Amino acid sequence: RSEIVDFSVPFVETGISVMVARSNGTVSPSAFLEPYSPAVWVMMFVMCL
Amino acid sequence: KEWNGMMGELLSGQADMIVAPLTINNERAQYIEFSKPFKYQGLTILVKK
Numbered sequence: 001r002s003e004i005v006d007f008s009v010p011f012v013e014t015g016i017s018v019m020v021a022r023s024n025g026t027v028s029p030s031a032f033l034e035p036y037s038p039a040v041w042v043m044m045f046v047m048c049l
Numbered sequence: 050k051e052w053n054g055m056m057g058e059l060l061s062g063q064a065d066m067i068v069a070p071l072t073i074n075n076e077r078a079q080y081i082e083f084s085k086p087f088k089y090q091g092l093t094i095l096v097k098k
Contacts, residue, residue: 010085
């Protein structure tokens, strides 16, 4: 089209894009059961002993 | 009279091509000729994480 005609400045962008449905409700990972830092758990064990 | 930077170099005659990340806007378009964009972008804010 640009070879036989003369276009202008593109006032809107386009292209071959991809549409993907968003994953509703991200699940907490397996390691989500540890809010305490690793040093936290170790210190608790040592105090218990 | 004052075209500071790489733009002055192209306009004065030192260089006849300005291959670089040069944004397309009205002021430059009035004086020099811009080819079709090779990358579409836009101003954005960068902040520290």
